[PDB]
Amino acid sequence: ISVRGLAGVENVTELKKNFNRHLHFTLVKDRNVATPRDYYFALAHTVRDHLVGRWIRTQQHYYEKDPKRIYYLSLEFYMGRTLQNTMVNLALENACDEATYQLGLDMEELEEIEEDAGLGNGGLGRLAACFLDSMATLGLAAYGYGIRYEFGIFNQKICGGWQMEEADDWLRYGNPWEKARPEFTLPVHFYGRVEHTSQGAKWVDTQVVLAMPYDTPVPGYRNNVVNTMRLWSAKAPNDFNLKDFNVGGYIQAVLDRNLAENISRVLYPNDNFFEGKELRLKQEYFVVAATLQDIIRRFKSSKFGCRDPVRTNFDAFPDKVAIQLNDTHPSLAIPELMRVLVDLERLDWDKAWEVTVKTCAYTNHTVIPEALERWPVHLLETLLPRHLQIIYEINQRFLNRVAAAFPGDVDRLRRMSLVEEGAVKRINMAHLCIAGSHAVNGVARIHSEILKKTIFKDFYELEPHKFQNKTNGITPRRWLVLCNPGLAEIIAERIGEEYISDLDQLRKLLSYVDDEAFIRDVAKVKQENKLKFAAYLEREYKVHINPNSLFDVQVKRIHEYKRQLLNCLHVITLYNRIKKEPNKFVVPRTVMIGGKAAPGYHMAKMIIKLITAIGDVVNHDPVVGDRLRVIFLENYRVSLAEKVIPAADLSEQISTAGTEASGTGNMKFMLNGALTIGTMDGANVEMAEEAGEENFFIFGMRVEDVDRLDQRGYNAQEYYDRIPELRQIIEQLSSGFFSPKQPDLFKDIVNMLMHHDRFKVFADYEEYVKCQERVSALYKNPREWTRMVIRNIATSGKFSSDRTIAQYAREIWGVEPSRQRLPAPDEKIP
Amino acid sequence: ISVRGLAGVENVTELKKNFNRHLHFTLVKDRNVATPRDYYFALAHTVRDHLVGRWIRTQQHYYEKDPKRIYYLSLEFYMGRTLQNTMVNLALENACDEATYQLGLDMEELEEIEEDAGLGNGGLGRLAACFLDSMATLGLAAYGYGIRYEFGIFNQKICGGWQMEEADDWLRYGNPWEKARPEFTLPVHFYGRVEHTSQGAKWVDTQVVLAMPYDTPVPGYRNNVVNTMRLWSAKAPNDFNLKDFNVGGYIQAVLDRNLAENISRVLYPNDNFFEGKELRLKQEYFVVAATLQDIIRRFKSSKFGCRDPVRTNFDAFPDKVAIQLNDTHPSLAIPELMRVLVDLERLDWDKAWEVTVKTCAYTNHTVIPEALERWPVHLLETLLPRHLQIIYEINQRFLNRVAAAFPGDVDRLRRMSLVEEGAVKRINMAHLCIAGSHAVNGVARIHSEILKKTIFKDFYELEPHKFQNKTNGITPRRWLVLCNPGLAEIIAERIGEEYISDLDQLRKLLSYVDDEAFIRDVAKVKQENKLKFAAYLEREYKVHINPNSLFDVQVKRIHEYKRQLLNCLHVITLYNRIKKEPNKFVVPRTVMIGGKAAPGYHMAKMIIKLITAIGDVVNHDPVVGDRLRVIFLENYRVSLAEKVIPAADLSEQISTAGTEASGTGNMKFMLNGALTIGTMDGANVEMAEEAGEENFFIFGMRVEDVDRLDQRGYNAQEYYDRIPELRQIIEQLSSGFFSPKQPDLFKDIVNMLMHHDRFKVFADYEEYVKCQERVSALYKNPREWTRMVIRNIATSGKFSSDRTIAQYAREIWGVEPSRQRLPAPDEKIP
Ligand SMILES: O=C1NC(=S)N[C@@]12O[C@H](CO)[C@@H](O)[C@H](O)[C@H]2O
Ligand SMILES: O=C1NC(=S)N[C@@]12O[C@H](CO)[C@@H](O)[C@H](O)[C@H]2O
Ligand SMILES: *Cc1c(COP(=O)(O)O)cnc(C)c1O
Ligand SMILES: *Cc1c(COP(=O)(O)O)cnc(C)c1O
């Protein structure tokens, strides 16, 4: 059937009875009233059973051996569905397929019932998810720590061409994967005030919110390692949230508990954008405060909570603990670690600071200013008074270091300060992270260089040793084997299966680049993938597409910097050229654009409307026929990504040079047989460098060009004046060609494009359509297109998150990855 | 070990492995980190397993045979713990005891970990719970329908002698007994307006709240019948509760979902008191609206949703459905049934009315005016506009009936109206229930007569056939076998086990009233019970009591009508007599008073403080010694009741004649070997009539006396003037004898007692202490005390809820109870 494992005789039988056990005893249903949803659950529980044994021994294992622990703190974990991934990592896929088949059910139909765990916004959240999979696969004692939002990223609905947001109640039917651990609930404090008494400061009169943990298993790939992802949920204490007496109402006091519990209610739907709301800051401290107590408790046990030097010496803390900050969201971990160490454990400042810097490491994910976290001082002052005091003290000592290093450089002092003066004082969380971490890294080579050369230049000059790079990656398990079994199979037929956990081995595919059979196969799976997607489209969304055309897709969050608008200009151009010469042949294309716009992002929502507006005209023009279709992919998410990416021919990574930190969707397309048209931005540079620029469709300005243009001054009118095709498009938008009933509907887009385009869309227009012509030319030559595809796939190995993780482990955490199978799952009950 | 069933070889082995299965796979724990709470859960899941098989076949059974269904609607179900009760009804108690013993665990210690399901206030809620147990034991196709509050009756804490309330988060660690059924979610409407168009009225522009059901199994006693209790939970829709667009905030819209979900958040803690809050009315309509759609859906299937006459003829509705209204809380079921039948199904009014009256039956639980539900018209008008219109129409036609029957009687017309004029117009829900039900019943003989003679006199004259009586009862399973196995054993040694489901057989115990062995045994178990309770007291609450003294206990909600104050007067009297003649012998007593006060009930909270105030003085007076102890039993609830009742010697049922509808605690004490000192009120009359007045300690005014006194006019001063002992007590309270630091602390109590005592405490004082002297005299004669006890126990059979239910079944619902074992639980998987 494929190498989804063995369909053993004993195990298919065992699976079936356990499926029936759960359908009866767990779901309390009988075959005569069971619905597909019940069947999905019976299966999920049956599969979950297989990893609890391993989960228990893995955790027990870490307790006995006591290795250095890695704590990955993030406010986002974009997991997606977990049934198939678990089967894949446990080699249960074929057995389960066989078993459900014999039970007369279609496993694929049941897999579609699982809701996505959309606890993330996009790239930052999905990276964390890929990282977790890689850390388990590499046998690291790693824990993912975050917030269990009851409402994840909103479900997107397109009404009248407009995006409609609706709550993502992913827990509505329950989550069979998580395990509530009420017994490990911890208290978190807010507000209060600081008392300075005799031997130390005291954080007093605080409001308490409880943090209840929920653990989700994270299985490594076929190594019997099952790590843990711990998500915190907010709960109101039953005392003060009722006991602070003297009138108000008993009923009201109980109803008001949903005020402390609102902290973990919903994920902020912002991508690459900072919103300074109090609820956000509470979420940030909540995850940090709870996570740190858990980390220290585990440390106090270790082998110190037995003997060792005997005396809670936190000198060994950094030798046993490593905490990675996924962006600045969990940045309060630095002043919170100091608070505990200094205020509670009573360590002297300097010893505490040495420990803190040695265990903390910070990763930066963006350079756009509006994405930078700068919290107003009055907020921190009210919500976290002691922390503000600690931050000021950290700043005081840091600036003293600067002054000593750069005597007289008074401007450098204000530039490097963690405290920004002006309208309202703010705290620059990024500066905080750099100061309190022993390592700072970018997520792609060019992005990391940009941090050193621009944004954190002064910091780099002070401590050059801190700055590093760790190019992002993606897990080959979910992003190949899971979503593209057909491609994984033909690759395995030639080079084996060892590449799933050693992607570098894909290079061996280079020697089949002239193989006639392979070329035919690679081309066949892509065709099968496009037919399946073309079907799914009419199935769930309804209104036909042509599977023979070129599948041109750009899927990612909607942003001005991602330039979906530039893609739009090209689409309208294609349309205008066809209308000019109807009977001329052009390569048919189906351009698919999908992505969510943050609810408050007006321009991004305007762009979604433009896209659907273009589709309304283009898709109903009889002269165009099936040569050009414009489709907006609704509710783009992880599960949807697993469907489109394997079916794409052309991957659009067209951000303005210097704005996309790395990108990861680009890597997903490369591994799945799509060719890339893009700018020299983020990881695109390393991808073209790995495949060879001849096998990549690069165009537009490089970072240097963008700067040259900024010195000069960007004037969009120039481009409008010298390019008739561009002018024609702008006048079409301006006059209502795409919005008849509302002729001025797109005035904001045109106005912006002509007067305030921060991402110089027009500057890359000419080179973009010229480059698009080259891809069309190559598509007309199936054999050569596929051969270039093989060059990309065979050369994507470097982009596996196993490589990224191995580098974090060795260069930042100080731990050695291992591909050693943990001693089977075998029963055991001590 | 006792007759808690057989400890079979095969089953103890089977139990142990399943216990281990759950500890591992369900709790994901290993013996080395499992805590007593984990063990309790492993056991609960193992026990729960045994009844899912029976649950499925019982429900399937009702589907095939299609009998008339009984729907018990109540806003309260006071269930308590469910582990032991389930073991008892499944004959699993000894096997489980043995198995956990071999696993090295103490089953009793684990049972204490289970949280009480306190979804009720007291008697009304516990009756529903007893009823459910009896309906299953009698093989009736009955369903309990209510609300799944996430916070039940508050946990009571005594601080400085004052009651402190704290949220009852009973779901904090999860509920292993319930089964969420998200697939059966239903929509409920609120607000909106009424449109009158061509062919009928339309309820329009309503706000929708979803009702999600949770099913809890209700096992019958050893008959393999497992009925269902369906509790509704409020959920916000994900559309409009986000989709009603045009600014407000996406985050805020999501956070505001906890506004529609607040409907099922907390139980109103009022006992015998009406609070007209909008949240309460929403709860009432919520349970009714959801329950009715479920009932009709089930009906539409039956054997009509196949063939029969073919044409949804609701003429057979009352032949297949019976809905019992537990008080007026679910009274909107009447106008809601009409709404659906008339507005949706399009039945003519009269056919709809005939159907409604024939399926609805109403039970009244109180006669005090402040407990009567009278909803302001402006509330119904805003929240349920169509229902108000239906109520007015029902009223119009009803009053026409009255006028025709009593021509010219204009005052009778306004007295009987469902609409009360005055300050604000209100709707008298009780009048509504009587008009739309084919049966109205009281809960004890005297209470039922009072309804006919007083409160509903006019209604009784109009339709005498509607009024009936159904004296309350208690389940012998939980209230004997479960809480008092020792007594159940010795009874079974002589007369067998058939009495557990046929309590009348207890009469056979009369012939052992002179048996020397039995007298010694009955006295021995009571002594063992008192020693266990005396221990529990120091264990969990700490500060010693004497197990040789007479256990004088009054446990029930705190109310002026229950007269805990009268009990207090007696206690202070005993104390004053001892201080007068220290060296005189008196029978030692431990008087225990426990009960919760509604949070807003100031006087009731003042009484709790008085009780603890008396204990402060009495318990620390060296002259008193161990002859008198005053103890306030904290957080009185079902699980606590199961501990005190079996250990009591004297049961206090001293309400003012005519105020306690029935009472059920009185019945619990009688069955467990306590003697009763009380008034001729509620079921006390039938109890003394069953045991013989010679074996009962009756005192005080009868109903007639109370009325005579009211004609005359009640003047407390008279009693104060003629009784020195009473005067002395009042002057002790007034002067601060019981409240040194705050001498005027009890001015409200004294003021009330002297000028506004609605329950004439002083009028029964003399006869009360005189009667108390008689019980003390009899206690001095162990042999005769125990013989009188045997007379009570042997004669309590009539008070089993199996008797009550059998009467409701035959005289109201029209169904025949059956003690036929359902065809085993045996596997089966069709
Ligand atoms: O997706 C992202 N959202 C933010 S904010 N930063 C992001 O992080 C990802 C993971 O490092 C990068 O791949 C994206 O380029 C970057 O925009
Ligand atoms: O306990 C009760 N609370 C209210 S209100 N009415 C009650 O109902 C019980 C069940 O019928 C009766 O036993 C009580 O006498 C009555 O007060
Ligand atoms: C991989 C992924 C992303 C990141 O895509 P980019 O193109 O780097 O912005 C966002 N959303 C989902 C659903 C993804 O799978
Ligand atoms: C039986 C019971 C009641 C009712 O007691 P009465 O004395 O009739 O008021 C109230 N609360 C609990 C906990 C009960 O078990």
Question: Coil, strand or helix: which one is A492?
Answer: helix
Residue to substitute in A664, A666, A670, A676 for testing ligand 3 pocket (most ligand atoms within 8 angstroms of CB): A664
Which among A261, A241, A238 has a CA at the least distance from the CA of A252?
A241
What is the spatial distance between Cα B102 and Cα B782, in angstroms, rounded to a whole number? 41
Question: Coil, strand or helix: which one is A102?
Answer: helix
Interval between CA A367 and ligand 1 midpoint (Å): 10
What is the spatial distance between Cα B48 and Cα B226, in angstroms, rounded to a whole number? 12
Active site residue A196: no
Residue to substitute in B72, B74, B272 for testing ligand 2 pocket (most ligand atoms within 8 angstroms of CB): B272
Give the pair of three-digit tokens for residue A446.
Answer: 């060019």
CATH fold, domain A474-800, is Rossmann fold (3.40.50)
Q: Is A305 annotated as a binding residue?
A: yes
CB contact under 8 A, A254 and B238: no
3-state percent breakdown (helix, strand, coil) of chain A, nearest 5 = 50, 15, 35
CA A682 to ligand 1: nearest atom: 15
Q: Confirm if A598 and A267 have CB atoms less than 8 A apart.
A: no
Point out the residue among B179, B183, B266 whose CB comes nearest to the CB of A254: B266
Residues of A in contact with B31 (CB under 8 A): 829-830
DSSP code for B154: P
Q: Confirm if A618 and A588 have CB atoms less than 8 A apart.
A: no
What is the spatial distance between Cα B57 and Cα B824, in angstroms, rounded to a whole number? 9
CA angle (B488 as vertex; B483, B491 as ends), nearest 5:
160
Count of other CB atoms within 10 angstroms of residue A795:
21
Residues 334-393 of A with CB under 8 A from B: none
Length of chain B: 830
Catalytic pick among A54, A426, A431, A556: A556
Which among A579, A566, A556, A555 has a CA at the least distance from the CA of A628?
A579
Residues of A in contact with B279 (CB under 8 A): 251
Which among A122, A108, A114, A128 has a CA at the least distance from the CA of A594?
A122
Q: Which residues line ligand 4 (CB under 6 A)?
A: B 122-123, 126, 556-557, 636-638, 641, 663-665, 668
Q: Confirm if A566 and A609 have CB atoms less than 8 A apart.
A: no
Which among A81, A208, A58, A77 has a CA at the least distance from the CA of A142?
A58
DSSP code for B756: -
What is the spatial distance between Cα A521 and Cα B562, in angstroms, rounded to a whole number? 87
Topology match between the domains B1-473+801-824 and B474-800:
yes
User: What distance, in Å, lies between the first and last C-alpha atoms of chain B?
Assistant: 39
What is the spatial distance between Cα B49 and Cα B47, in angstroms, rounded to a whole number? 5
H/E stretch holding B208: strand B207-219
The torsion of the CA quartet B156, B159, B163, B165, rounded to 10 degrees, works out to -50
Count of other CB atoms within 10 angstroms of residue B419:
18
Which among A536, A513, A750, A784 has a CA at the least distance from the CA of A641?
A536
* Edge-to-edge strand ranges of the sheet holding B675-678: B628-633, B589-594, B550-555, B650-653, B675-678, B697-698
Sheet strands (E) in B634-763 = 650-653, 675-678, 697-698
Residue B189 vs residues A353, A715, B88, B334: alpha-carbon distances, Å = 59, 57, 42, 16
State the binding site of B: 30, 63, 297-306
- DSSP strand pairing (B550-555 vs B589-594): parallel
Helical axes A83-90 vs A123-137, angle rounded to 10°: 20
What is the spatial distance between Cα B255 and Cα A149, in angstroms, rounded to a whole number? 12
Q: Confirm if B666 and B555 have CB atoms less than 8 A apart.
A: no
Residues 2-21 of B with CB under 8 A from A: 20
Give burial (CB, 10 Å; 0-12/13-18/19+) of A246. Answer: exposed
What is the spatial distance between Cα B6 and Cα B25, in angstroms, rounded to a whole number? 28
Amino acid letter for position A294: D
Q: How far is B829 from chain A (nearest CA, A)?
A: 7
For residue A164, the cross-strand partners are: A157
What is the spatial distance between Cα B373 and Cα B396, in angstroms, rounded to a whole number? 20
CA angle (A70 as vertex; A64, A74 as ends), nearest 5:
140
Which among B27, B53, B55 has a CA at the least distance from the CA of B40?
B27
What count of Cα atoms within 13 Å lies in the side-chain half-sphere of residue B478?
A: 33
User: What distance, in Å, lies between the first and last C-alpha atoms of chain A?
Assistant: 39
For residue B323, the cross-strand partners are: B71, B360
Ligand nearest to the CA of B474: 4
A641 pocket-lining for ligand 3 (C-beta < 6 Å): yes
* Edge-to-edge strand ranges of the sheet holding A550-555: A628-633, A589-594, A550-555, A650-653, A675-678, A697-698
Give the pair of three-digit tokens for residue B790.
Answer: 């045997």
Q: What is the 3-state secondary structure (H, E, C) of A9-71?
A: HHHHHHHHHHHHHHHHHHCCCCCCCCCHHHHHHHHHHHHHHHHHHHHHHHHHHHHHHCCCEEE
What count of Cα atoms within 13 Å lies in the side-chain half-sphere of residue A688?
A: 18
Among protein residues, the one with the nearest Cα to ligand 4's atom 15 is: B638
A607 pocket-lining for ligand 3 (C-beta < 6 Å): no
What is the spatial distance between Cα A356 and Cα A333, in angstroms, rounded to a whole number? 9
Catalytic pick among A126, A562, A570, A803: A562
Give burial (CB, 10 Å; 0-12/13-18/19+) of B602. Answer: exposed
Residue A504 vs residues A475, A485, A651, A794, B647: alpha-carbon distances, Å = 13, 19, 22, 9, 76
- DSSP strand pairing (A426-428 vs A440-442): unpaired
Question: Coil, strand or helix: which one is B800?
Answer: strand
B166 touches chain A (CB under 8 A): yes
Please state whether A5 falls in left (phi above 0), alpha (psi between -120 and 50) or beta. left
Q: What is the 3-state secondary structure (H, E, C) of A314-348?
A: HHHHHHHEEEEEECCCCCCHHHHHHHHHHHHCCCC
Question: Coil, strand or helix: which one is A793?
Answer: helix
What is the spatial distance between Cα B166 and Cα A593, in angstroms, rounded to a whole number? 54
Report resolution in angstroms.
Answer: 2.3
Give the pair of three-digit tokens for residue A379.
Answer: 């907020």
What count of Cα atoms within 13 Å lies in the side-chain half-sphere of residue B598?
A: 18
Architecture of domain B1-473+801-824: 3-Layer(aba) Sandwich (3.40)
Give the pair of three-digit tokens for residue B562.
Answer: 């229950």
What is the spatial distance between Cα A266 and Cα A278, in angstroms, rounded to a whole number? 13
Non-local (6+) Cβ contacts of B225 within 8 A are B54, B58, B136, B137, B139, B219, B822
Among protein residues, the one with the nearest Cα to ligand 3's atom 8 is: A663
Active site residue A786: no
Q: Confirm if A370 and A274 have CB atoms less than 8 A apart.
A: yes
CA B617 to chain centre: 34
Which among A258, A221, A226, A227 has a CA at the least distance from the CA of A242?
A258
Interval between CA B576 and ligand 2 midpoint (Å): 35
Helical axes A485-495 vs A516-536, angle rounded to 10°: 170
Point out the residue among A49, A266, A277 whose CB comes nearest to the CB of B254: A266
Give Rg (Cα) of chain A. Answer: 28
DSSP code for B244: S
A31 touches chain B (CB under 8 A): yes
Q: Is A539 annotated as a binding residue?
A: no
Residue B791 vs residues A754, B485, B490, B796: alpha-carbon distances, Å = 100, 19, 15, 9
Q: Confirm if B663 and B653 have CB atoms less than 8 A apart.
A: yes
Interval between CA A665 and ligand 1 midpoint (Å): 10
What is the spatial distance between Cα B562 and Cα B86, in angstroms, rounded to a whole number? 33
CB contact under 8 A, A28 and B52: yes
Interval between CA A664 and ligand 1 midpoint (Å): 8
Active site residue A425: no
CB contact under 8 A, B166 and A266: no
Q: How far is B828 from chain A (nearest CA, A)?
A: 9
What is the spatial distance between Cα A634 and Cα A642, in angstroms, rounded to a whole number? 14
Question: Coil, strand or helix: which one is B79?
Answer: strand
Point out the residue among A24, A166, A254 whose CB comes nearest to the CB of B167: A254
Q: How far is A185 from chain B (nearest CA, A)?
A: 11
Backbone angles phi and psi of B650, in degrees to 5: -120, 125
Residue to substitute in B76, B131, B553, B557 for testing ligand 4 pocket (most ligand atoms within 8 angstroms of CB): B557
Give the pair of three-digit tokens for residue B14.
Answer: 């089977």
Ligand nearest to the CA of B633: 4
Give Rg (Cα) of chain B. Answer: 28
Method: X-ray
Domain ranges of chain B: 1-473+801-824, 474-800
Catalytic pick among A656, A664, A676, A795: A664
Q: Is A304 annotated as a binding residue?
A: yes
A665 pocket-lining for ligand 3 (C-beta < 6 Å): yes
Q: Confirm if A372 and A430 have CB atoms less than 8 A apart.
A: yes
Give the pair of three-digit tokens for residue A132.
Answer: 């977790």
DSSP code for B224: S
Sheet strands (E) in A266-394 = 321-326, 360-363, 374-376
What is the spatial distance between Cα B675 and Cα A357, in angstroms, rounded to a whole number? 74
Report the largest interatomic distance among the alpha carbons of chain A, rounded to a whole angstrom.
Answer: 90
A663 pocket-lining for ligand 3 (C-beta < 6 Å): yes
DSSP code for B679: -
Amino acid letter for position B679: T
Mutate to test the interface with A, among B50, B103, B250 (most CBs of A within 10 A): B250
